[PDB]
Assembly symmetry: C2
Homo-oligomer: 300 residues x 2
């Protein structure tokens, strides 16, 4: 539609904690008797250069970690490493633990992020994982350990934890198994975001959203080949569209009676000629941070 929306953040707010090792404070996620946070919490200045994490961690005791849930200190009674995450066992299982899963999303998919500072929910926003495996977020002075999530009924699917700002100001992080999205690493290296593309699947979904809402002036009489579309789109720095993507857009295509390649033909014409001062869904640009599922969830 028109407004981009985040999921209501309440269920995730009740899981946010502050984790401190000496001089470093970040956010952790408290689910049952476990707190999850970036492993780099155990790290200092010089450590970030080339950290032997599994060495630095051998040093630490349970009493090293200060876990604060609002006004209560949670006793840490275990710690371990899973990839780029520290897992802290605490003596209290979170009475607000929602129904939840850990998922790994795909590039181009959207999720809500609750930005927190020192364990304290600060703001909520909706974003996409970019094709280049980074997020164009707003993570400021101490937001590491903030999570991305989707909510389907009363089940929270956690998908993202924030680890690092990249040289461009874009954000890099892991799933909830501690595996980075992207080639990125939790140390100070020369790593930079790759060049980014537009999420074609998502633009197409948003064009379906527009048509569903009666904004359809951009439709035309013609069709295109998949390959002929990709030939045009890639010149505009759009992600090649796959047959898998064509299939993903199936329900919206059946809802509107507009074949995906008929819609590609409309997009092709939009890219070559522009909007000509017009708007789609009150936008002067082609929007790419709404998935097919987002579109179905909201209007459709």
């Amino acid at each position: 539609g028109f407004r981009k929306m985040a999921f209501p953040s309440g269920k995730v707010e009740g899981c946010m904690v502050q984790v401190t090792c000496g001089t470093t404070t970040l956010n952790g996620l408290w689910l049952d008797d476990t707190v999850y946070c970036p492993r780099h919490v155990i790290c200092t200045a010089e450590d970030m250069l080339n950290p032997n994490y599994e060495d630095l961690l051998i040093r630490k005791s349970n009493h090293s970690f200060l876990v604060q849930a609002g006004n209560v200190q949670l006793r840490v009674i275990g710690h371990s490493m899973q990839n780029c995450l520290l897992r802290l066992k605490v003596d209290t299982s979170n009475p607000k633990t929602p129904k939840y899963k850990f998922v790994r999303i795909q590039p181009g998919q959207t999720f809500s992020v609750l930005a927190c500072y020192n364990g304290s929910p600060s703001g909520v926003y909706q974003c996409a994982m970019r094709p280049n495996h980074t997020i164009k977020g707003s993570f400021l002075n101490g937001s590491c350990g903030s999570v991305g999530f989707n909510i389907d009924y009363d089940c929270v699917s956690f998908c993202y934890m924030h680890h690092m700002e990249l040289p461009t100001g874009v954000h890099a992080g892991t799933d909830l198994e501690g595996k980075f999205y992207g080639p990125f690493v939790d140390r100070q290296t020369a790593q930079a975001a790759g060049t980014d593309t537009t999420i074609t699947l998502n633009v197409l979904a948003w064009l379906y959203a527009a048509v569903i809402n009666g904004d359809r002036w951009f439709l035309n009489r013609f069709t295109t080949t998949l390959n002929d579309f990709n030939l045009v789109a890639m010149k505009y720095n759009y992600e090649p569209l796959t047959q898998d993507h064509v299939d993903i857009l199936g329900p919206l295509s059946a809802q509107t009676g507009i074949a995906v390649l008929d819609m590609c033909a409309a997009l092709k014409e939009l890219l070559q000629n522009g909007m000509n001062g017009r708007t789609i869904l009150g936008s002067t640009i082609l929007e790419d941070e709404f998935t097919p599922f987002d579109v179905v969830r909201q209007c459709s």
Copy 2:
């Protein structure tokens, strides 16, 4: 200032309930022993074309209102009208009630809306009260009695309740005292939104945010009088900027080292020459939905 950020919505989620009258169902807000919802819950299609609310309400008892917090019915044990709100008294206080205030906001100010359907939170989004007293984006359809709010520390400031859709997609609603923002009424007339302007003060605030984020290309060596800035900006449908507005921009001016009148000179040039295919904070248009306070809170 890349991302519009909503306040975390958990304190408000715990306050949302469904209120049913006949076959009319909408959202209510349960604070302690009271449920606030729009008065037009008591109206039908007949009634909405020309309601006398006093005459409609007197025909009602406590039992005619069905209020549900989730699956659990709350019994109504008192009812009164406050301007365009119904106030229902219930036989339980809400243990989830946060600290809270009712505030009437001013046009150009921002707030978060928790969009709900049948007392079930659906999404949260950040928005501005437009100078013409409407709220933009078409994303409050079905969500009558959804509330806007701001949060400061642990205190929710409720500022907005959704009532109506105008013929132009945008929404109208009241404060939590039942008073409309703008010249609208809760009946089915041809009332329309007045002329709207761009929130000049917010655009300047956002331009400051871009300089703080290292986006600097639109600055110039020129300055301007407030008068001459206004002679131009008013041609482009921008709110007149007053000295009060210049003064609000002080902190941001002192942070960046750019004089407010110098930054106005930048905006004048940007209005007169357009953006020339460049972006500012990722946008191809000048954003007016971040207040100076938002920019301090979120950008720097």
